[PDB]
Amino acid sequence: MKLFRVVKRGYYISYAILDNSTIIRLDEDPIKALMRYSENKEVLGDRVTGIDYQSLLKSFQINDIRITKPIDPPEVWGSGISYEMARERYSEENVAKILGKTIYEKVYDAVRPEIFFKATPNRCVGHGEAIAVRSDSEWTLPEPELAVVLDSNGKILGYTIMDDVSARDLEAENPLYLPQSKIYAGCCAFGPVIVTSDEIKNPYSLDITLKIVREGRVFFEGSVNTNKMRRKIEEQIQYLIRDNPIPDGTILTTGTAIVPGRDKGLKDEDIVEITISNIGTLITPVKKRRK
Amino acid sequence: MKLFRVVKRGYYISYAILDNSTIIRLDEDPIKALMRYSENKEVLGDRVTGIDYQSLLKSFQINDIRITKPIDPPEVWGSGISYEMARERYSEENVAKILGKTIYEKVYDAVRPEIFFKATPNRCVGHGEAIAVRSDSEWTLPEPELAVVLDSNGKILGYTIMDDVSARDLEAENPLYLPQSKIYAGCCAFGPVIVTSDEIKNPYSLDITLKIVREGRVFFEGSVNTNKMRRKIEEQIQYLIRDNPIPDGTILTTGTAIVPGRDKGLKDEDIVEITISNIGTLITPVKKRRK
Amino acid sequence: MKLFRVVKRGYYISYAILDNSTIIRLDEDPIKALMRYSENKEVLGDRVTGIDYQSLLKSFQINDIRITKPIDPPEVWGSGISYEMARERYSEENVAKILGKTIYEKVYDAVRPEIFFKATPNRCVGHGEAIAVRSDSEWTLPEPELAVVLDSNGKILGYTIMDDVSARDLEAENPLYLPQSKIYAGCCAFGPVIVTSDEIKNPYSLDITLKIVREGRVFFEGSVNTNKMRRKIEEQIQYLIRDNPIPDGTILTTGTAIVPGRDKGLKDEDIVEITISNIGTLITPVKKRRK
Amino acid sequence: MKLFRVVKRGYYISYAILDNSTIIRLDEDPIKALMRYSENKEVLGDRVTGIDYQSLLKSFQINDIRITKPIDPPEVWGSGISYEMARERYSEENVAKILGKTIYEKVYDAVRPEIFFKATPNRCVGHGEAIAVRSDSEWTLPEPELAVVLDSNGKILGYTIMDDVSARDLEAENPLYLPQSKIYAGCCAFGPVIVTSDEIKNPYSLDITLKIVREGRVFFEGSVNTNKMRRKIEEQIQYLIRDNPIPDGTILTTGTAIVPGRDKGLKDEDIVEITISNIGTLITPVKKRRK
Ligand SMILES: [Ca+2]
Ligand SMILES: [Ca+2]
Ligand SMILES: [Ca+2]
Ligand SMILES: [Ca+2]
């Protein structure tokens, strides 16, 4: 089951597409619906015709309906430095270093992984909506990541593509500015669908691809496979929920491995495209904030 | 106007006490009520007898009613290193240092202050309720702070006492563990009231006092005045709201200056008392989390 | 307990006055509150000062608050011809008569009493609000009645004064026009309070008094005691609920004995005052409907 | 557009069927949807497959879904003696008569028609649900009628089949018992659909057919056309709304012309079938009330 939501005349409608192309309109709340499918694979609703899912991915935006965030995640959390060579996060001399070793390569080795609060639902956007660059950021990058939808017990309800938009220049300036660099209006994008757990046989065998498009020009292209992930997801979830209750429908984003250069910073009207196998391609335009 | 809330048989009731001891039961939502008083100093409700405010502060807990969080703040944010000598936050050789200067004494000097996400409402507790020490923390300290209640425009609606409970050992281990050290169940306490802006003539002239009580024993006592605050509140608010929309009733906590030693770590059944002039005294028992 | 409601800036507030003059602001819904007092005589709320109940009865209407319908009764039902000499309801030759005996004097004798649907809540008005005379009625009279508040099981939750406003000329024209004569906008008034069952020792010993006031002039005055009621209330309730479920807070009005003459018909700007012992006096101005 | 509702696992879903057999699942409230179609003939929703409307009419009741009342009418009103020869309503000597002429043949002639309150929504049932015979009624008949759905201005939003279930023996006993004979649990049935105004070209040219089925046996069969209606619907609506506000979705039932005999009274387990051209056939089992 691949799950998506549209906004129509002020109200939401949620639809699920099956492997045989049949589209089902949902009766329940999408988060409630994912929790159901997790237990017994049951879906409540009616089969619908005249809903062009493929056109929605391309155009947005057809007649009356517009695709958006598939769910409203009550909390979005992030997990840092889970990949090979992710330690070199700003290799300039010098960043923050404890006993000669940098803070980022410390966490890569340490038992306890990095976990940070990323966004509230109203700070998130969906497929076809604009992500943002802070007014006071000269170097902001998109971070293409595999993200999991969780229940209150930390059980994986599904997978999605997430863009952890990071004002990298503020982070490099001082690690204590990380929250300012990560948490703002339009700092987070996910979609276009949330695939159910059974739609992906192996989460550690998926192709993530980033493309930044500036006036038709491919400004950056890079891709990495999930087999390069060292810190496993189950461990990230374990440290997330420890003494820390999360609501149903929490999204955890698993960290990035595709890092564009110092010159590849985002600017107004850019088009960020992220592709993950079996899920789809998330396309979000970029909007530079005015001071 | 000094504003407080009680829970009674599953439902909330909000009361306001005036300077002449008269107590008013509120008609509106407390956050909505603070926004009103901010504009024209109007209070909607009836004067009530038989509500013993002084007994509520001491006992909790009288007949049918129990004092709790005065409001439900949709978001709680924190501001770090705003005081003199707050730079020495773990002076051990070495913590995180950029170009020989430590990250904490960098922020003290830098134009951009430290701002971090602290808690969601359900992670907060009130007067007489238990704060928590993480199951995996050997050194957790309370941080006595002056806190402001804000509207969506960043206007100060009122003041309160806040305990920013911090698992200091995890922070010292690596600054990237800060979110884990700060954000958890029972990580935050505030109250017992929210005083309106006009109840404090000068916010930079208030006595903050910390007391940790272990089996009747005064385990720690320290106090500092707000005149020692270098980073002004208006500046902290400015950087909080920048490209970052906050809901009505957001609490910002302004940073601490009272820091107990390495030996003064919290443990089960402790009693943390925090006093700020004109506001009152916040008393919260301590509960150690089981693994 | 004597229960009343006020409207204040678009919202309702319910208050209860006790025998020792102490006034309590209610926590619960008034219908829910009456059901509670019926079981264990418990009242949830706070004692309030500055609520001038006596002034509310006279003026309406003080500062911010206006008295209105004490509850919103989901259904209002009526019971006809329960009094001595009520058989002579329009003695003119002739009204509707079966086998030489008139339909009204038939019901007075018959095992089965008269029960009719009277109003929906939005068709009812309260103390100080305007009752109405239909645009096509030349002879409309008020019917001063003792009314009971019922739960779904038909248990008496309390007593109130009710005005069953009846377009008597339409009824006399044809008994099948009774629903048109009884059910319309402003066809029903009750209040000013609902007294709890224990406030009246004997419901069959109460003085009901009607007064129609035209420009300061006492246009009609009449009064009768409830000891003149032949058809008992418990029997009226029995036939009401039979195969007919009623919601909680249903009002049953027990029939009238004070009937003004053919010349004493109501007209615009009249003042109808109804008094019942231990309850109070219900005052409603009259408003003639335009065609 | 022909509109119907189903109940599924505790919640309602509304569907519309078009003339070309295409079935649309509705986005809006059915009453809100009828008001829309009345203004511009616009329908909000998605075309659905796998909803077997024809099977729903026969079986009820398929898998997960059960047909019921197409809407929840806030008020149901009735209009009496609108047909030829309807004057002979119980011709026995004697019923209620004014000046030698019977009350029923008076209303047939009089300018003012008969209008009565019939039911609240919770007293109504739908296609496939049980209608009721009062525990104290020895002669109860179904009254097959054309019914209109109205808005607050008295505009016709659509048509449906309605059964005005009447305890005829109580009415014959005394006309003042009419409310008891008409208003009770399961006193009213309508459906199976509500057809939009444009689905019927001429409301005064429709075949209404009654069938009472006792253990497979056709116990009664009778039918009459709407061209035999003397009192027009527009006039019935006019007298309904006069000084009497009705909510959106009010149903008015236009009176019957098919009257079974004194021996044809209803009893337990009977099957009452009513057919009106272009609308469908309403089938409701009968359930005798226990004392
Ligand atoms: Ca990231
Ligand atoms: Ca702090
Ligand atoms: Ca009456
Ligand atoms: Ca009828």
mmCIF file with all atom_site columns, C-alpha atoms in Angstrom, chain B residues 79-203:
data_model
loop_
_atom_site.group_PDB
_atom_site.id
_atom_site.type_symbol
_atom_site.label_atom_id
_atom_site.label_alt_id
_atom_site.label_comp_id
_atom_site.label_asym_id
_atom_site.label_entity_id
_atom_site.label_seq_id
_atom_site.pdbx_PDB_ins_code
_atom_site.Cartn_x
_atom_site.Cartn_y
_atom_site.Cartn_z
_atom_site.occupancy
_atom_site.B_iso_or_equiv
_atom_site.pdbx_formal_charge
_atom_site.auth_seq_id
_atom_site.auth_comp_id
_atom_site.auth_asym_id
_atom_site.auth_atom_id
_atom_site.pdbx_PDB_model_num
ATOM 1   C CA . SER B 1 79  ? 18.196 30.334 25.370 1.00 0.00 ? 79  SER B CA 1
ATOM 2   C CA . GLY B 1 80  ? 21.721 29.408 26.489 1.00 0.00 ? 80  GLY B CA 1
ATOM 3   C CA . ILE B 1 81  ? 24.700 31.248 28.042 1.00 0.00 ? 81  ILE B CA 1
ATOM 4   C CA . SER B 1 82  ? 23.116 34.645 28.690 1.00 0.00 ? 82  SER B CA 1
ATOM 5   C CA . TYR B 1 83  ? 24.897 35.256 32.001 1.00 0.00 ? 83  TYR B CA 1
ATOM 6   C CA . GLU B 1 84  ? 28.331 36.305 33.282 1.00 0.00 ? 84  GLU B CA 1
ATOM 7   C CA . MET B 1 85  ? 30.717 33.395 33.992 1.00 0.00 ? 85  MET B CA 1
ATOM 8   C CA . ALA B 1 86  ? 28.280 31.003 32.256 1.00 0.00 ? 86  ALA B CA 1
ATOM 9   C CA . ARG B 1 87  ? 31.156 30.431 29.787 1.00 0.00 ? 87  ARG B CA 1
ATOM 10  C CA . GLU B 1 88  ? 32.843 28.044 32.247 1.00 0.00 ? 88  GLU B CA 1
ATOM 11  C CA . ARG B 1 89  ? 30.163 25.403 31.512 1.00 0.00 ? 89  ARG B CA 1
ATOM 12  C CA . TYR B 1 90  ? 32.325 22.324 32.247 1.00 0.00 ? 90  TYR B CA 1
ATOM 13  C CA . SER B 1 91  ? 35.847 23.835 32.366 1.00 0.00 ? 91  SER B CA 1
ATOM 14  C CA . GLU B 1 92  ? 37.475 20.380 32.105 1.00 0.00 ? 92  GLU B CA 1
ATOM 15  C CA . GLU B 1 93  ? 40.245 19.840 29.528 1.00 0.00 ? 93  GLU B CA 1
ATOM 16  C CA . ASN B 1 94  ? 38.785 19.505 27.151 1.00 0.00 ? 94  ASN B CA 1
ATOM 17  C CA . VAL B 1 95  ? 35.238 20.180 25.954 1.00 0.00 ? 95  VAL B CA 1
ATOM 18  C CA . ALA B 1 96  ? 34.305 21.255 22.407 1.00 0.00 ? 96  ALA B CA 1
ATOM 19  C CA . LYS B 1 97  ? 36.622 24.045 21.235 1.00 0.00 ? 97  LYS B CA 1
ATOM 20  C CA . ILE B 1 98  ? 36.909 25.913 17.922 1.00 0.00 ? 98  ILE B CA 1
ATOM 21  C CA . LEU B 1 99  ? 40.333 27.497 17.254 1.00 0.00 ? 99  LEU B CA 1
ATOM 22  C CA . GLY B 1 100 ? 41.383 27.093 20.911 1.00 0.00 ? 100 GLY B CA 1
ATOM 23  C CA . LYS B 1 101 ? 38.338 28.924 22.284 1.00 0.00 ? 101 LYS B CA 1
ATOM 24  C CA . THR B 1 102 ? 35.511 26.810 23.758 1.00 0.00 ? 102 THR B CA 1
ATOM 25  C CA . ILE B 1 103 ? 32.100 26.684 22.018 1.00 0.00 ? 103 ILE B CA 1
ATOM 26  C CA . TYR B 1 104 ? 30.334 28.104 25.086 1.00 0.00 ? 104 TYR B CA 1
ATOM 27  C CA . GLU B 1 105 ? 32.583 31.168 25.434 1.00 0.00 ? 105 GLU B CA 1
ATOM 28  C CA . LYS B 1 106 ? 32.244 31.662 21.665 1.00 0.00 ? 106 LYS B CA 1
ATOM 29  C CA . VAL B 1 107 ? 28.445 32.064 21.914 1.00 0.00 ? 107 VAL B CA 1
ATOM 30  C CA . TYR B 1 108 ? 28.794 34.414 24.909 1.00 0.00 ? 108 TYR B CA 1
ATOM 31  C CA . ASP B 1 109 ? 30.763 36.793 22.648 1.00 0.00 ? 109 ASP B CA 1
ATOM 32  C CA . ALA B 1 110 ? 29.117 36.145 19.250 1.00 0.00 ? 110 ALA B CA 1
ATOM 33  C CA . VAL B 1 111 ? 26.382 38.347 17.735 1.00 0.00 ? 111 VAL B CA 1
ATOM 34  C CA . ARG B 1 112 ? 24.048 35.349 17.364 1.00 0.00 ? 112 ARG B CA 1
ATOM 35  C CA . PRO B 1 113 ? 22.932 33.888 20.734 1.00 0.00 ? 113 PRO B CA 1
ATOM 36  C CA . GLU B 1 114 ? 22.154 30.236 21.488 1.00 0.00 ? 114 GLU B CA 1
ATOM 37  C CA . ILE B 1 115 ? 18.538 29.162 20.925 1.00 0.00 ? 115 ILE B CA 1
ATOM 38  C CA . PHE B 1 116 ? 17.305 25.574 21.310 1.00 0.00 ? 116 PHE B CA 1
ATOM 39  C CA . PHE B 1 117 ? 13.997 23.696 21.298 1.00 0.00 ? 117 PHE B CA 1
ATOM 40  C CA . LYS B 1 118 ? 13.280 22.544 24.858 1.00 0.00 ? 118 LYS B CA 1
ATOM 41  C CA . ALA B 1 119 ? 9.911  20.774 25.209 1.00 0.00 ? 119 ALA B CA 1
ATOM 42  C CA . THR B 1 120 ? 6.398  20.019 24.009 1.00 0.00 ? 120 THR B CA 1
ATOM 43  C CA . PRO B 1 121 ? 3.542  20.662 26.506 1.00 0.00 ? 121 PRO B CA 1
ATOM 44  C CA . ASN B 1 122 ? 3.161  16.956 27.388 1.00 0.00 ? 122 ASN B CA 1
ATOM 45  C CA . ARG B 1 123 ? 6.867  16.883 28.319 1.00 0.00 ? 123 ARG B CA 1
ATOM 46  C CA . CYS B 1 124 ? 6.289  19.687 30.861 1.00 0.00 ? 124 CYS B CA 1
ATOM 47  C CA . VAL B 1 125 ? 5.105  19.459 34.484 1.00 0.00 ? 125 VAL B CA 1
ATOM 48  C CA . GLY B 1 126 ? 3.850  21.977 37.066 1.00 0.00 ? 126 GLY B CA 1
ATOM 49  C CA . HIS B 1 127 ? 4.017  22.971 40.737 1.00 0.00 ? 127 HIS B CA 1
ATOM 50  C CA . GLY B 1 128 ? 3.856  19.855 42.928 1.00 0.00 ? 128 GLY B CA 1
ATOM 51  C CA . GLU B 1 129 ? 4.446  17.412 40.065 1.00 0.00 ? 129 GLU B CA 1
ATOM 52  C CA . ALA B 1 130 ? 7.530  15.252 39.499 1.00 0.00 ? 130 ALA B CA 1
ATOM 53  C CA . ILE B 1 131 ? 10.467 16.240 37.283 1.00 0.00 ? 131 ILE B CA 1
ATOM 54  C CA . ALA B 1 132 ? 12.630 13.397 35.944 1.00 0.00 ? 132 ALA B CA 1
ATOM 55  C CA . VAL B 1 133 ? 16.223 12.179 35.720 1.00 0.00 ? 133 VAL B CA 1
ATOM 56  C CA . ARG B 1 134 ? 16.933 10.086 32.597 1.00 0.00 ? 134 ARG B CA 1
ATOM 57  C CA . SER B 1 135 ? 17.613 6.382  33.234 1.00 0.00 ? 135 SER B CA 1
ATOM 58  C CA . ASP B 1 136 ? 21.037 6.702  31.569 1.00 0.00 ? 136 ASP B CA 1
ATOM 59  C CA . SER B 1 137 ? 22.182 9.923  33.279 1.00 0.00 ? 137 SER B CA 1
ATOM 60  C CA . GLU B 1 138 ? 24.601 9.916  36.220 1.00 0.00 ? 138 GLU B CA 1
ATOM 61  C CA . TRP B 1 139 ? 24.733 13.724 36.542 1.00 0.00 ? 139 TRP B CA 1
ATOM 62  C CA . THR B 1 140 ? 21.511 15.708 36.024 1.00 0.00 ? 140 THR B CA 1
ATOM 63  C CA . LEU B 1 141 ? 21.074 19.281 37.294 1.00 0.00 ? 141 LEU B CA 1
ATOM 64  C CA . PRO B 1 142 ? 18.142 21.701 37.552 1.00 0.00 ? 142 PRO B CA 1
ATOM 65  C CA . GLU B 1 143 ? 18.575 25.063 35.816 1.00 0.00 ? 143 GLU B CA 1
ATOM 66  C CA . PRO B 1 144 ? 16.614 27.839 37.619 1.00 0.00 ? 144 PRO B CA 1
ATOM 67  C CA . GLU B 1 145 ? 15.511 30.384 35.012 1.00 0.00 ? 145 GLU B CA 1
ATOM 68  C CA . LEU B 1 146 ? 13.260 33.369 34.380 1.00 0.00 ? 146 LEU B CA 1
ATOM 69  C CA . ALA B 1 147 ? 10.858 32.485 31.574 1.00 0.00 ? 147 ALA B CA 1
ATOM 70  C CA . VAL B 1 148 ? 8.636  34.632 29.344 1.00 0.00 ? 148 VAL B CA 1
ATOM 71  C CA . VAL B 1 149 ? 5.264  33.786 27.789 1.00 0.00 ? 149 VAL B CA 1
ATOM 72  C CA . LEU B 1 150 ? 5.070  35.043 24.192 1.00 0.00 ? 150 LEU B CA 1
ATOM 73  C CA . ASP B 1 151 ? 2.443  35.625 21.517 1.00 0.00 ? 151 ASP B CA 1
ATOM 74  C CA . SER B 1 152 ? 2.962  34.866 17.797 1.00 0.00 ? 152 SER B CA 1
ATOM 75  C CA . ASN B 1 153 ? 4.508  38.329 17.298 1.00 0.00 ? 153 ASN B CA 1
ATOM 76  C CA . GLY B 1 154 ? 7.053  37.780 20.085 1.00 0.00 ? 154 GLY B CA 1
ATOM 77  C CA . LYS B 1 155 ? 5.362  40.177 22.508 1.00 0.00 ? 155 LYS B CA 1
ATOM 78  C CA . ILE B 1 156 ? 5.883  39.353 26.201 1.00 0.00 ? 156 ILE B CA 1
ATOM 79  C CA . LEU B 1 157 ? 2.548  38.288 27.711 1.00 0.00 ? 157 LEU B CA 1
ATOM 80  C CA . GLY B 1 158 ? 3.979  37.421 31.135 1.00 0.00 ? 158 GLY B CA 1
ATOM 81  C CA . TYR B 1 159 ? 6.697  35.915 33.341 1.00 0.00 ? 159 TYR B CA 1
ATOM 82  C CA . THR B 1 160 ? 7.107  32.594 35.164 1.00 0.00 ? 160 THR B CA 1
ATOM 83  C CA . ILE B 1 161 ? 9.691  30.419 36.945 1.00 0.00 ? 161 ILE B CA 1
ATOM 84  C CA . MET B 1 162 ? 11.064 27.590 34.780 1.00 0.00 ? 162 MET B CA 1
ATOM 85  C CA . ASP B 1 163 ? 13.253 24.580 35.541 1.00 0.00 ? 163 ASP B CA 1
ATOM 86  C CA . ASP B 1 164 ? 15.282 23.542 32.498 1.00 0.00 ? 164 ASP B CA 1
ATOM 87  C CA . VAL B 1 165 ? 16.237 20.053 33.691 1.00 0.00 ? 165 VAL B CA 1
ATOM 88  C CA . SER B 1 166 ? 19.517 19.102 31.981 1.00 0.00 ? 166 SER B CA 1
ATOM 89  C CA . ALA B 1 167 ? 21.365 15.759 31.900 1.00 0.00 ? 167 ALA B CA 1
ATOM 90  C CA . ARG B 1 168 ? 24.721 17.551 32.146 1.00 0.00 ? 168 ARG B CA 1
ATOM 91  C CA . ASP B 1 169 ? 26.894 14.429 31.824 1.00 0.00 ? 169 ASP B CA 1
ATOM 92  C CA . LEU B 1 170 ? 25.578 13.674 28.316 1.00 0.00 ? 170 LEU B CA 1
ATOM 93  C CA . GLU B 1 171 ? 26.215 17.268 27.220 1.00 0.00 ? 171 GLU B CA 1
ATOM 94  C CA . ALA B 1 172 ? 29.810 17.126 28.514 1.00 0.00 ? 172 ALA B CA 1
ATOM 95  C CA . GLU B 1 173 ? 30.281 13.829 26.662 1.00 0.00 ? 173 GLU B CA 1
ATOM 96  C CA . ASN B 1 174 ? 29.469 15.501 23.307 1.00 0.00 ? 174 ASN B CA 1
ATOM 97  C CA . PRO B 1 175 ? 27.595 18.772 22.505 1.00 0.00 ? 175 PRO B CA 1
ATOM 98  C CA . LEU B 1 176 ? 25.599 16.898 19.824 1.00 0.00 ? 176 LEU B CA 1
ATOM 99  C CA . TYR B 1 177 ? 23.907 14.947 22.638 1.00 0.00 ? 177 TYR B CA 1
ATOM 100 C CA . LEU B 1 178 ? 22.371 18.216 23.884 1.00 0.00 ? 178 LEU B CA 1
ATOM 101 C CA . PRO B 1 179 ? 18.865 17.390 22.504 1.00 0.00 ? 179 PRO B CA 1
ATOM 102 C CA . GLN B 1 180 ? 18.959 14.019 24.318 1.00 0.00 ? 180 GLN B CA 1
ATOM 103 C CA . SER B 1 181 ? 20.119 15.786 27.493 1.00 0.00 ? 181 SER B CA 1
ATOM 104 C CA . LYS B 1 182 ? 17.356 18.420 27.326 1.00 0.00 ? 182 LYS B CA 1
ATOM 105 C CA . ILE B 1 183 ? 14.258 16.851 25.716 1.00 0.00 ? 183 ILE B CA 1
ATOM 106 C CA . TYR B 1 184 ? 12.484 13.989 27.543 1.00 0.00 ? 184 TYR B CA 1
ATOM 107 C CA . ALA B 1 185 ? 9.480  13.099 29.737 1.00 0.00 ? 185 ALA B CA 1
ATOM 108 C CA . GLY B 1 186 ? 9.453  15.425 32.755 1.00 0.00 ? 186 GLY B CA 1
ATOM 109 C CA . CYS B 1 187 ? 12.385 17.475 31.443 1.00 0.00 ? 187 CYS B CA 1
ATOM 110 C CA . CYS B 1 188 ? 10.652 20.785 32.132 1.00 0.00 ? 188 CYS B CA 1
ATOM 111 C CA . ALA B 1 189 ? 8.763  22.475 34.985 1.00 0.00 ? 189 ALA B CA 1
ATOM 112 C CA . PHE B 1 190 ? 7.115  25.897 35.322 1.00 0.00 ? 190 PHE B CA 1
ATOM 113 C CA . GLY B 1 191 ? 4.775  27.898 37.562 1.00 0.00 ? 191 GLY B CA 1
ATOM 114 C CA . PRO B 1 192 ? 3.209  28.087 40.025 1.00 0.00 ? 192 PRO B CA 1
ATOM 115 C CA . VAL B 1 193 ? 1.702  31.179 38.363 1.00 0.00 ? 193 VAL B CA 1
ATOM 116 C CA . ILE B 1 194 ? 2.200  33.308 35.271 1.00 0.00 ? 194 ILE B CA 1
ATOM 117 C CA . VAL B 1 195 ? 2.414  36.961 36.293 1.00 0.00 ? 195 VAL B CA 1
ATOM 118 C CA . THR B 1 196 ? 1.266  39.616 33.828 1.00 0.00 ? 196 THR B CA 1
ATOM 119 C CA . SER B 1 197 ? 3.845  42.014 32.357 1.00 0.00 ? 197 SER B CA 1
ATOM 120 C CA . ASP B 1 198 ? 2.741  44.878 34.640 1.00 0.00 ? 198 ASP B CA 1
ATOM 121 C CA . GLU B 1 199 ? 3.392  42.837 37.816 1.00 0.00 ? 199 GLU B CA 1
ATOM 122 C CA . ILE B 1 200 ? 7.160  43.200 37.293 1.00 0.00 ? 200 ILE B CA 1
ATOM 123 C CA . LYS B 1 201 ? 8.515  46.754 36.965 1.00 0.00 ? 201 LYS B CA 1
ATOM 124 C CA . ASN B 1 202 ? 12.059 45.640 36.140 1.00 0.00 ? 202 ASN B CA 1
ATOM 125 C CA . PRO B 1 203 ? 12.774 42.096 34.838 1.00 0.00 ? 203 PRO B CA 1
#
